[PDB]
Amino acid sequence: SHVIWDSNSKLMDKSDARHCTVIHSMSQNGWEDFAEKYDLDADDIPSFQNP
Amino acid sequence: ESILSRFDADWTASDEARREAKNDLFFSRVSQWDDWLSQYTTLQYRGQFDVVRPVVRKLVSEMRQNPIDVLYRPKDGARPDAADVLMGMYRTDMRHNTAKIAVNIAVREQIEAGVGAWRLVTDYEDQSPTSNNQVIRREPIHSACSHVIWDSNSKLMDKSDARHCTVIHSMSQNGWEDFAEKYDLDADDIPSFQNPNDWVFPWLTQDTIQIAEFYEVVEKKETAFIYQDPVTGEPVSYFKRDIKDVIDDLADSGFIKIAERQIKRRRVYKSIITCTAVLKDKQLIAGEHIPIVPVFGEWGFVEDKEVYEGVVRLTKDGQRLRNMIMSFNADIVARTPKKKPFFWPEQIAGFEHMYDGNDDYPYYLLNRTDENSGDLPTQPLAYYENPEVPQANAYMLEAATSAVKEVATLGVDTEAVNGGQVAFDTVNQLNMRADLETYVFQDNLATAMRRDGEIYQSIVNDIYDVPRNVTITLEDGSEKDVQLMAEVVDLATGEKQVLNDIRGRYECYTDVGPSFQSMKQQNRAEILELLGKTPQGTPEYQLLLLQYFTLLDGKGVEMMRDYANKQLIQMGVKKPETPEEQQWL
Amino acid sequence: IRGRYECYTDVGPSFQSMKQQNRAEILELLGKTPQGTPEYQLLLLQYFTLL
Amino acid sequence: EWGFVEDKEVYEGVVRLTKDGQRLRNMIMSFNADIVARTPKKKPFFWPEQI
């Protein structure tokens, strides 16, 4: 929906930047095993492109 | 207020109360009986209509087309012949099948209402623990209809994470029986929740029967074990990532540990999840692995809304409107005083003798004179009402028939090739892959091929450990070679309950191909249609002998297993998985 | 001792295990057993239906 | 594998013909459903002198 990325898109090998556009979104139940990454302040008070 | 976390995830499931509960409200109403409840000035006779269900029940015949009768994906040098009870899960035969026939009604809740789940006799079954070879098949979950559906993930399941967070089963005053196989405590809390309603509530349900049990929440079994920190071993570390590389070399010859994995774990526990109620006590379920039966349906979503809208998306206004036309035809006879043309009946109301419907020749008196008028006809022939605009409606019906028919179109096929395989029947094999995992996931006690003398397993071998002269069967006689004559007959190394990654067992799982796949069966089914794809010639006289049997074990076929080809063996035979017979050799 | 008995539901196709199923498919005629000399083994014996 | 115009672009669907492709079928819906409420009582009337 909110992710539109213009970079390369052609060669399946991608000799280009070698990084897909990385965007991850879920609901507040994402505690899960996700506490196995980051979890210091656990909220950076960000927001991303919500229309 | 983080002392309760998952509870406001119940109140995150409050997002489906004011939005998606209307959705499943209609999902029950649009596909079953009435639809639109506004209720303003409604017509008299109603309530036998339906004309909803049939369209799906024919299509779901396709659902019935995928038995496939799977076997174990045969191996190369592994011949589990006498390995017997292990992989004989599919020899469960007629042993117990039971509830399977309910899966037909399990085709209804995937469209109509929120999809349910499947019950299991709780873990280890207490009905006749006679040796091994004990199981039962495919028991469903009650209800899961109008009350609550998941907020968890709703993607697809890899999930070494926490999975299948809830079990809630009963509705009745009689509902006390389900948990009776546990300590069955009597009448404590009885909370008030789960209140679907339009807030008018003309009827009465104060009924509840809601229980919430989940045994170990966020049990967080992981590895997360580090040591050998550089200086003094600062506490409160909790190394956060599973990947290990850069630490491959640090201290050169510095130190050694010499200890196995012995895990002493403090447990942080918050609550057994519910607001005011804590009941479940003293017993917890299962273990590392996840036998859990319940499976998934097929629904899409992006934002909070999650809908797979049914096959009933179509007929709507081609139904109610034909119910409304009873106002434009049947209701005029109620509006009109039933067709009373009267031109100069000077006697006003109908008299008893003249009109009962009786047959009267004269119908005597008519006198055409009146007050001062003038002489010219005044004609009633202006007809009052006539039917108006029948044609439009008449054709409206055909147009509606086309519109409602249109959604029947998927993969239209008569016969032969170019079949109709589409999502639904392919994606519920991911629901039916759960079968064989629910069975063969792990077996701790009896995997034993030969009786091992469990955990005492040395058995008889010790004779070959003696220094002095050692022998073997000698001097022939009546007793020469009998099965299980002493050689070793024992297993070295280690076989223990839940050995996990060590191979030899876990290799047996599902196939999921087209209708008939290969035990040997692929080759004979590629004949496709007609006939004549089978090679010919003289050699298949002598090569056609054995392997063309699809009977396997019949009734009287066991006669021919030992004898087989015999007399002139110098051509060679298969000598199949049992080469039991060597004597004069 | 629930569950150990010799007779329970066989539910499946209507074919009968006594010299039918191989030939009991109606619209599929023949051809699944081609020609052979040693098939005497199956020819000279197993074709006898005595019930 | 699709066509292109400039930069990266608005997505061409097969639904671009289906937007108004339904067209005016809906106009036969205009004469029936709720608009009898707009019509005040088709009046069968003549010689009603009841004052």
Token digits of residue D37: 């409420």
* Spacing of C-alpha B79 from chain mean position: 33
Rg (chain C; Cα; Å):
16
DSSP helix/strand/coil, B98: helix
Helices (H), B445-537: 522-525
Closest residue by Cα to residue B139 from B99, B96, B92, B181: B99
The answer, for B441 touching chain C at a CB cutoff of 8 Å, is no
Q: Are B564 and B573 in contact (CB under 8 A)?
A: yes
Query: How far apart, in Å, do the first and last CA atoms of chain C sit?
Result: 34
| CA angle in degrees (0–180, nearest 5) for B558-B560-B565 | 160
Among B192, A4, B163, residue whose Cα is nearest residue D9:
A4
Residue numbers of A between 1 and 30 with CB closer than 8 Å to B:
1, 26-29
DSSP B375: S
Find the CB nearest C1 among B130, B524, B550.
Answer: B130
Q: Read out DSSP for B175-223?
A: GGGGGGGTT---S---------S-S---S---------B-SSTT-----
Q: Which two tokens stand for residue B216?
A: 């170990």
8 Å CB contact between B318 and B401: yes
Three-state DSSP state, B142: coil
B75-80 long-range Cβ contacts below 8 angstroms, 24+ apart: B75/B507, B78/B507, B79/B577
**Contact: D44, B385; criterion CB under 8 Å:** yes
CB-based contact, A31 to chain B, within 8 Å: yes
- Going by C-alpha positions, the residue among B398, B395, B394, B425 that lies closest to residue B410 is B425
Instruction: Give CA B336 to chain center in angstroms.
Output: 57
Which residue, chain included where needed, has tokens 């066991």? B558
Q: Output the six-digit token pair for B158.
A: 């890899």
Token digits for B53?
């269900």
Do the beta carbons of residue B113 and residue B28 sit within 8 Å? yes
In angstroms, the CA B563 to CA B573 distance is: 12
**Looking at chain D, how many residues does it have?**
51
Q: Are A31 and B236 in contact (CB under 8 A)?
A: no
Q: State the Cα–Cα distance between residues B114 and B150, nearest whole angstrom.
A: 9
Q: Which two tokens stand for residue B193?
A: 């929740």
Contact partners for chain D, using 3 or more CB pairs closer than 8 A, are: A, B
Which residues of B are less than 8 Å from D33 in CB distance?
317, 321, 324
Per DSSP, the three-state class of B34 is: coil
Chain centre distance of CA B347: 77
Chosen for mutation from B7, B240, B243 (greatest number of chain A CBs closer than 10 Å) is B240
With contact defined as beta carbons under 8 Å apart, do B561 and B552 qualify? Answer: no
> Of B565, B110, B84, B514, which Cα lies nearest the Cα of B311?
B110
Burial B209-238 (b: 16+ CB within 10 A, else e): bbbbbbeeebeeeeeeeeeeeeeeeeeeee
* CB atoms near residue B390 (< 10 Å): 10
Q: How many Å apart are CA B29 and CA B138, to the nearest integer?
A: 29
In whole angstroms, what is the distance from residue B168 CA to residue B177 CA?
14
| Chain C contact probe: residue of B91, B98, B548 with most C CBs at under 10 A | B548
The Cα C30–Cα C42 span in angstroms is: 16
Closest CA to C49 of C17, C24, C18: C18
Residues of A in contact with D7 (CB under 8 A): 6
For chain B, the 3-state helix, strand and coil shares in percent, each to the nearest 5, are 20, 0, 80
Please tell me the distance from the alpha carbon of residue B2 to that of residue A32, in angstroms, as a whole number. Answer: 15
Burial class (CB in 10 A: 0-12, 13-18, 19+), B112: buried
**Which helix H or strand E contains B140, and what residues bound it?**
strand B139-140
Q: How was this structure determined?
A: X-ray
Q: Provide, as residue numbers in chain A, all residues whose Cβ is less than 8 Å from the Cβ of B9.
A: 28-29
Q: Whole-angstrom Cα distance, residue B389 to residue B425?
A: 47
Q: Which of B438, B412, B343, B334 is nearest to B92 (CA)?
A: B438
Kindly give, in sequence order, each residue whose CB lies less than 8 Å from that of residue B233, ignoring residues fewer than 6 positions away: B227
Dist CA B349 CA B328 (whole Å): 29
d(CA B356, CA B46): 34
Alpha carbon separation from B67 to A49, B140, B414, B428 (Å, rounded): 48, 19, 21, 12
User: Would the CB atoms of B222 and A36 count as touching at under 8 Å?
Assistant: yes
Where does residue B299 fall: left (phi above 0), alpha (psi -120 to 50 degrees), or beta otherwise? Answer: beta
Measured distance CA(B214)–CA(B229) in Å, rounded: 38
Nearest CA in chain D to B396: D28
- CB distance A32–B161 less than 8 Å? yes
Residues of B in contact with A32 (CB under 8 A): 161-162
Can you name the residues that pair with B139 across neighbouring β-strands?
B119
Closest chain A C-alpha to B248 CA, distance in angstroms: 22
The Cα B429–Cα B432 span in angstroms is: 4
Alpha carbons B125 and A30: distance in angstroms, whole number: 35
3-state SS assignment for residue B103:
helix
Q: How far apart are CA B60 and CA C48, in angstroms?
A: 42
- Contact flag for D and C (3+ C-beta pairs < 8 Å): no
Backbone Cα Rg of chain A: 15
Q: Which of B6, B63, B80, B456 is nearest to B298 (CA)?
A: B63
DSSP letters spanning B100-129: GGGGGGGGTTTTSS----EE---SS--S--
Q: Kindly list the residues from chain B whose CB atom is less than 8 angstroms away from the CB atom of residue A31.
A: 5, 218
Question: Among candidates B264, B163, B162, B149, which has minimal Cα distance to B220?
Answer: B162
Nearest to C48 by CA among C18, C15, C14: C18
Using CB atoms within 10 Å of the CB of residue B24, give its burial: 0 to 12 exposed, 13 to 18 middle, 19+ buried.
Answer: buried
In this structure, are residues B404 and B517 in contact, taking their beta carbons and an 8 Å threshold?
no
Residue D10 in tokens: 């608005």
Which other chains touch chain B, taking contact as 3+ CB pairs less than 8 Å apart? A, C, D
> Would you call A9 and D8 a contact, using CB atoms and an 8 Å cutoff?
yes
Q: Assess whether chains A and C touch, using the rule of 3 or more C-beta pairs within 8 angstroms.
A: no
* Resolution of the coordinates, Å: 3.3
Which helix or strand (DSSP H or E) is residue B57 part of?
Answer: helix B54-59
- The two tokens of residue B354 are 């003249």
Length of chain B: 585
Per-residue tokens: B153:
């993930």
Torsional class of B528: left (φ above 0), alpha (ψ -120 to 50), beta (otherwise): left
Please, which residues bridge with residue B325 across strands? none
CB-based contact, B343 to chain D, within 8 Å: no
**How deeply is B273 buried, as exposed, middle or buried, from its count of CB atoms within 10 A (0-12, 13-18, 19+)?**
buried
Cβ–Cβ < 8 Å for B196, B21: yes
Cα–Cα distance between B320 and B312 in angstroms, integer?
Answer: 13
CB contact under 8 A, A32 and B242: no
Q: Residue B23 belongs to what H/E stretch?
A: helix B20-31
DSSP B248-300: SSSSTTS-----------------SS-SS-----S-----SS-----------
Nearest to B396 by CA among B312, B314, B319, B313: B319
Copy the structure tokens of residue B72.
């174990």
Residue D47 neighbours by CB under 8 Å, 6+ apart: none
